[PDB]
């Protein structure tokens, strides 16, 4: 009953912060967004732009998705993001992440009517 579109917002949108609040950001966010519930999700990116700006990427530069599907789109502008990557010493259920802030072009997969982001593919 959580739609794919909503799942993308839960896993990948954080418009509140302009950047990676703190060295603790990923630890807090991976947990609070329920990405550490059944396992430590290994890598996950949060975008610090408006929902409208991220949704707009679905009409931007069409690029191949990593899995070979055709429905991925790269932002023309750079966007403020935070990459979370699980540490080597991280042990479920105490999932531990390195927080890295970047300004990069994002690549999202879009699907549906309306055509909206449903997966975060990459940043470049």
Curated annotation (Swiss-Prot):
Family assignment from sequence similarity: Belongs to the pancreatic ribonuclease family.
Catalytic activity: an [RNA] containing cytidine + H2O = an [RNA]-3'-cytidine-3'-phosphate + a 5'-hydroxy-ribonucleotide-3'-[RNA]; an [RNA] containing uridine + H2O = an [RNA]-3'-uridine-3'-phosphate + a 5'-hydroxy-ribonucleotide-3'-[RNA]
GO biological process terms held by the UniProt record: defense response to Gram-positive bacterium
Uppermost EC category: lyase
Residues of the full protein shown: 27 to 150 of 150
Listed GO MF terms: lyase activity; nucleic acid binding; ribonuclease A activity; RNA nuclease activity
Disulfide bonding pattern of the chain: 26-84, 40-95, 58-110, 65-72
Annotated protein name in UniProt: Ribonuclease pancreatic
Function summary: Endonuclease that catalyzes the cleavage of RNA on the 3' side of pyrimidine nucleotides. Acts on single-stranded and double-stranded RNA.
EC number: 4.6.1.18
Quaternary state and interactors: Interacts with and forms tight 1:1 complexes with RNH1. Dimerization of two such complexes may occur. Interaction with RNH1 inhibits this protein. Monomer.
One term under GO cellular component: extracellular region
Subcellular location: Secreted
Keywords in alphabetical order: Disulfide bond, Endonuclease, Glycation, Glycoprotein, Hydrolase, Lyase, Nuclease, Secreted, Signal
Lineage summary: Eukaryota, Metazoa, Chordata, Craniata, Vertebrata
Superkingdom of the organism of origin: Eukaryota
Expression (tissue specificity): Pancreas.
Glycan attachment positions: 1, 7, 34, 37, 41
Positions of substrate binding: 7, 10, 41-45, 66, 85
Active site: 12, 119
């Amino acid at each position: 009953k959580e739609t794919a579109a909503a799942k993308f917002e839960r896993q990948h949108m954080d418009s509140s912060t302009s950047a990676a609040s703190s060295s603790n950001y990923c630890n807090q966010m991976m947990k609070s967004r329920n990405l550490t519930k059944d396992r430590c999700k290994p890598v996950n990116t949060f975008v610090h732009e408006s929902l409208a700006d991220v949704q707009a990427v679905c009409s931007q530069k069409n690029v191949a998705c990593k899995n070979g599907q055709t429905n991925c789109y790269q932002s023309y502008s750079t966007m403020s993001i935070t990459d979370c990557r699980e540490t080597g010493s991280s042990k479920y259920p105490n999932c531990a992440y390195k927080t890295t802030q970047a300004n990069k072009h994002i690549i999202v997969a879009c699907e549906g009517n309306p055509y909206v982001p449903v997966h975060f593919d990459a940043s470049v």
